[PDB]
Design an enzyme around this catalytic site. Structure first.
Site, PDB file in Angstrom:
ATOM      1  N   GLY A  17       0.804  -1.212   0.000  1.00  0.00           N
ATOM      2  CA  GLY A  17       0.000   0.000   0.000  1.00  0.00           C
ATOM      3  C   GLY A  17       0.836   1.260   0.000  1.00  0.00           C
ATOM      4  N   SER A  70       5.367  -4.879  -0.543  1.00  0.00           N
ATOM      5  CA  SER A  70       5.994  -3.587  -0.291  1.00  0.00           C
ATOM      6  C   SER A  70       5.229  -2.826   0.776  1.00  0.00           C
ATOM      7  CB  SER A  70       6.039  -2.771  -1.580  1.00  0.00           C
ATOM      8  OG  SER A  70       4.729  -2.526  -2.060  1.00  0.00           O
ATOM      9  N   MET A  71       5.948  -2.434   1.821  1.00  0.00           N
ATOM     10  CA  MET A  71       5.464  -1.748   3.012  1.00  0.00           C
ATOM     11  C   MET A  71       4.735  -2.717   3.940  1.00  0.00           C
ATOM     12  SD  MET A  71       6.003   1.186   4.425  1.00  0.00           S
ATOM     13  CE  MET A  71       6.980   1.315   2.937  1.00  0.00           C
ATOM     14  N   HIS A  75       9.620  -4.932  -3.787  1.00  0.00           N
ATOM     15  CA  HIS A  75       9.890  -4.190  -5.010  1.00  0.00           C
ATOM     16  C   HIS A  75       9.982  -2.718  -4.642  1.00  0.00           C
ATOM     17  CE1 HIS A  75       5.686  -3.094  -4.923  1.00  0.00           C
ATOM     18  NE2 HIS A  75       5.779  -2.437  -6.063  1.00  0.00           N
ATOM     19  N   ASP A  86      10.551  -7.124  -9.105  1.00  0.00           N
ATOM     20  CA  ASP A  86       9.811  -7.880  -8.106  1.00  0.00           C
ATOM     21  C   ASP A  86      10.527  -9.189  -7.811  1.00  0.00           C
ATOM     22  OD1 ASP A  86       8.052  -5.804  -8.622  1.00  0.00           O
ATOM     23  OD2 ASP A  86       6.735  -7.031  -9.875  1.00  0.00           O
TER      24      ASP A  86
END
Ligand SMILES: Nc1ncnc2c1ncn2[C@@H]1O[C@H](COP(=O)(O)OP(=O)(O)OP(O)(O)=S)[C@@H](O)[C@H]1O
Ligand SMILES: Nc1ncnc2c1ncn2[C@@H]1O[C@H](COP(=O)(O)OP(=O)(O)OP(O)(O)=S)[C@@H](O)[C@H]1O
Ligand SMILES: [Mg+2]
Ligand SMILES: [Mg+2]
EC number: 3.4.21.92
Lengths: 370, 191, 191, 370
Positions: free
Chosen positions: C67, C96-97, C121, C170
């Protein structure tokens, strides 16, 4: 020295006659020496013996036997109670300090609160302490003092009773054994009024009874055990990872014991859970006890190391301490031999051999009629 | 609207929604397309039941048409992680990641109704962009496919080759046929 | 519909939703795409737990597809700031995150389930306008990119150059591969 | 052996006099041989005999008479309680370990918590256990001990009592019958304070009265029956698959009983529901009990096997245990017999037959007065 030492320790008489009693006895001791009055003069450090003898407390200038006993009592306790090293150190330091001469003026040698999970050596370490020190163990199961009327029996006797056996159970015991270990097991069950008794003990060191007798708690070790917050220790969290509820358990201890009570305690020890490595030591302890019972019947038992390790994996439960290990010893070692002892080859002689069967992960018992 | 029910207790009467009352009896409903949000509710329920009774067997009524494979693995991991045996029952249909959770139950506790239908197929996913990125995402689905075949082989007991050939195309399996395949031990018609 | 679970205490019985009951046990749920609103709840939850018992560790289950980068930093900054060690468990998916928060957990208290998958990524963003504005906005993506790799390298312990090349495209890492990479210390087969 | 055995078992007297007591008495026994000083020399075996009488504890070197009784103890109990072989093994084996010399140093023979569904023999096994061993049964109904003031009686007297009787119902009872079976039926009903009282009874095997007398529980078998989670096993789960509910009772046990209490327990045996096969044996037991009642009146009962099976099906309920079987026997067999015994055809002894007819599916009674 006589007047100063006597008032400090002798608390059952007034100062003028009390001092003369130490001076008269001192001369009596010197004349009774086998030598022809070699120590004609009464020097210092001799009076210390008389006051110590009259007060029934350890004297200064500790003998080599006592010095060896206190030095050796760093591992001897660790040979019966494994782990919980921080708890043993607190007990020995208080004893070492008092005997060295550095101690509280009016408080006892030490006041400790032993809390923790079930099956840890909270009480055993106290019981074995009295044995190592050669002093009488004063036990007080606080589950009988849960009502206010019962607590009045500790400090003294109720006025209504006309029995000649007046006086309290704790004051009389302390007077009989001033140098002793006082165990208050399951103190959390006792009525809060008991705290008012201990509060003046740890602060002043003396508890006057209804009769008026003065009991000195200077040389008596104070150790009280409890299971406050024990439920949190065995409680499992709602999650993938079980969390350590030791911090939460301490909060419960702070709800039952007021800050003033804890503030006066010399230490508040928390007993850590038994580790796997420790269990192997605990198994050997129970195996030794089993051999002792068998020795009275002329039976010898030898257990392979592999079998000992297997018993640990079955009985090891961190939440339930070491009592489950005892059940394992009863089911796998005592039960097969009880049938053989009463009706079987093991009537006498023994020569038993226990070993693990890796194929079936079950022990094989071998009995010899001798 | 969801109905409410009364639970009689000595202390007093407690009001519970119909779903929550069943949760008290270790009954969890897996209905609808699998998603990250609904899976957490099933996961949270499994963890709560474990604390209440880590020995009693949990039950899971699977009536879902399948969904996100990764979200379902959160439920599969929890089923084997917790000590309780998570029994599985198939109500209505069972599809990709619905059947995977139906066969992931403990041996002797997996069940299916006589009319319950099971469907099994390989994961379906798509990504568009650079050729290098497509290869990376493509390799993942292939790796995940092998993990699905390997995991299903353990529970069903069939060889990977049988599952690999059968899972290539959609395969519908009725309750009796599913028992032969090994997805479930038996039917609940008579117990 | 979230179910209600009964909690029994000496004082009495109190009814709480499933999520609130787990929150009482220091169990936070990071589900769905990262956003400012859902992150505010996660941040608010950490502060409450820290005050109740700052010594006890906090567990943060993570099932997220990724997100907003900025929203996650609020959660990340709050984890390092508070005294409690914030454990992280990757259930189902991490991106991611979502994975950055997984590795952000305290050392020795980061885990992944056996069938979990995690991806990493570089930040994805875009802007439209004059070339001057695009330059500053583009420069910021590089600033966060370099800053993010510095944090991941710190937690994972790997070289900055290794993360830079790997992050570029990725990379789907399974649970065992994550341990070798350094994202998590081990797999949560059991405590 | 005198000093070691006396200090261990004789806990009410000091060692110098206590040890000399078994010496002086062992001499008198030695000179009172049947004809003329058969055994002039005293041996350790004679000391053990004297110690077992002074302390009223079972002696060592168990005679063959006791051995036969111990070996056949499981079989004898099996003839009375059916389907609870697990419980009998725990009780019998624990007893054997104590007699064989493998019992706990200071704990009781055995502490057990019999939790199970209704009518599963939780209390019958303990009642019959005493008859098999010929020892007194100390049955304490814990439903009465539901208030804190009531619990005081177990270890003391009510506050303000002026009479000489300051004894407790549990301490005095154990002192009078040290070797006995202690039964605390439905202990969960009792106030939690009672649990705190039994902690020392298991860990230390001693209970101190308010006066200070220390009871000895080293030979008293401790059995506690509880119906925890009875409502849960009675109710059926809201689901397609019915749940066992046996585990639910154990989770309630954890709530009612503190962890320290459960850790002290030797084992928690969960009594299982009675199968249809075992119910047939129960019917025979009830009929045999009915025959004993009828033999006094002079009448003999004969019941066909086909009738017994029909009665079992009529009264077979797993949730309700074996109590319904008594109701179907009382309604079908005792009710008609009573009408005749009181009013004709059974005043004097006469054989009676009870056989089922397939046509009517009802019992047929032939009084055949004689
Ligand atoms: N650390 C230990 N090392 C060796 N034996 C131990 C240890 N802890 C417990 N035991 C054994 O377990 C028994 C002692 O348990 P205790 O120490 O009396 O328990 P406790 O601390 O009083 O627990 P409660 O009852 O919950 S307050 C004896 O059989 C010991 O041999
Ligand atoms: N397992 C059994 N085997 C044989 N007879 C049994 C058994 N259980 C019960 N009975 C019979 O039923 C009678 C009553 O059983 P109870 O002693 O009341 O059982 P219980 O389990 O102790 O009961 P509660 O109500 O649960 S305390 C016994 O005296 C026997 O006649
Ligand atoms: Mg203790
Ligand atoms: Mg009963």
């Amino acid at each position: 020295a006589a007047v100063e030492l006597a008032v400090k320790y002798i608390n059952d008489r007034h100062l003028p006659d009390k001092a003369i009693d130490v001076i008269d006895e001192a001369g009596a001791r010197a004349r009774l020496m086998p030598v022809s009055k070699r120590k004609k003069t009464v020097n210092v450090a001799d009076i210390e013996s008389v006051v110590a003898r009259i007060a029934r407390i350890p004297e200064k200038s500790v003998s080599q036997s006592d010095r060896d006993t206190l030095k050796n009592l760093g591992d001897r306790l660790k040979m019966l109670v494994f782990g919980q090293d921080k708890a043993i150190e607190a007990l020995t330091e208080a004893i070492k300090m008092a005997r060295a001469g550095l101690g509280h003026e009016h408080k006892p040698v030490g006041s400790f609160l032993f809390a923790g999970p079930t099956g840890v050596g909270k009480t055993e370490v106290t019981v074995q302490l009295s044995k190592a020190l050669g002093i009488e163990l004063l036990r007080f199961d606080m589950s009988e003092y849960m009502e206010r009327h019962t607590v009045s029996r500790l400090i003294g006797a109720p006025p209504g009773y006309v029995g000649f056996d007046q006086g309290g159970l704790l004051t009389d015991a302390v007077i009989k054994h001033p140098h002793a270990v006082l165990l208050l097991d399951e103190i959390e069950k006792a009525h809060p009024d008991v705290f008012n008794i201990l509060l003046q003990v740890m602060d002043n060191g003396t508890l006057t009874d209804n009769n008026g007798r003065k009991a000195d708690f200077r040389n008596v070790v104070l150790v009280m055990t409890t299971n406050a917050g024990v439920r949190e220790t065995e409680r499992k969290s709602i999650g993938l990872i079980h969390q350590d509820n030791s911090t939460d358990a301490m909060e419960e201890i702070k709800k039952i014991f007021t800050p003033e009570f804890r503030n006066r305690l010399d230490n508040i020890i928390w007993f850590d859970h038994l580790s796997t490595d420790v269990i192997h030591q605990v198994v050997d302890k129970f195996i030794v006890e089993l051999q002792v019972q068998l020795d009275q019947k002329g039976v010898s038992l030898e257990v392979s190391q592999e079998a000992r390790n297997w018993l640990a994996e079955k009985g090891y439960d961190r939440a339930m301490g070491a009592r489950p290990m005892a059940r394992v010893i009863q089911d796998n070692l005592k039960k097969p031999l009880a049938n053989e002892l009463l009706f079987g080859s093991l009537v006498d002689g023994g020569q038993v051999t226990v070993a693990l069967d890796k194929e079936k992960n079950e022990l094989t018992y071998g009995f010899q009629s001798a | 609207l969801v109905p409410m029910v009364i639970e009689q207790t000595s202390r007093g009467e407690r009001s519970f929604d119909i779903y929550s009352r069943l949760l008290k009896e270790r009954v969890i409903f897996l209905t609808g397309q699998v998603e990250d949000h609904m899976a957490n509710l099933i996961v949270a329920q499994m963890l709560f039941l474990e604390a209440e009774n880590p020995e009693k067997d949990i039950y899971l009524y699977i009536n879902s048409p399948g969904g996100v494979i990764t979200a379902g693995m959160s439920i599969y991991d929890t089923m084997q992680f917790i000590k309780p045996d998570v029994s599985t029952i198939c109500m209505g249909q069972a599809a990709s990641m619905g059947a995977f959770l139906l066969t992931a139950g403990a041996k002797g506790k997996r069940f299916c109704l006589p009319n319950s239908r099971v469907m099994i197929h390989q994961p379906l996913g798509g990504y568009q962009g650079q050729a290098t990125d497509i290869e990376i995402h493509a390799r993942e689905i292939l790796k995940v496919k092998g993990r699905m075949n390997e995991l299903m082989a353990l529970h069903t007991g069939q060889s990977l080759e049988q599952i690999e050939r059968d899972t290539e195309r959609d395969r519908f399996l009725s309750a009796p046929e599913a028992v032969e395949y090994g997805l479930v031990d038996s039917i609940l018609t008579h117990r």
